[PDB]
Amino acid sequence: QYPIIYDIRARPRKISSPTGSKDLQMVNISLRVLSRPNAQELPSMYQRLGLDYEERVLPSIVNEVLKSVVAKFNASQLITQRAQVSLLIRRELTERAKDFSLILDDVAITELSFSREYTAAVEAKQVAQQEAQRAQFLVEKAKQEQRQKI
């Protein structure tokens, strides 16, 4: 008998996956994926995955699920609903890993990116909405700085 030294120590594997989101903004999202090889199927897991099972399961199922989820939200809709995005990513990735006897306690989005434009204009809208106020009272100031000139 050989000692099959499963690293059932949850070996988190931080893994990045670039994404074309639903609207297909280039969003790069990484995911720290917290895999323990399921104890109740470990021997089959060794006929099935081996000792470096983690490098044999997570490295790309993480990217699978990251891409699948992030490609279901617009550029902003990812920021706005990042809770939905991370929740869906974990929901799919836990079942992706559990196939090979890997219980993911946690799967969470570590980062998120875009170019800027969606959010740039989205910020500028409220920028200018109140720039309007920034200069309305200046309208008043000037209505009255004109009786200066009077």
Binding site: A121, A124, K125, A128, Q129, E131, A132, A135
Partner: peptide, 9 residues
């Protein structure tokens, strides 16, 4: 909307 509101400026 940006131009809508630059109008008001």
């Amino acid at each position: 909307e940006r131009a809508r509101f630059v109008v008001e400026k």
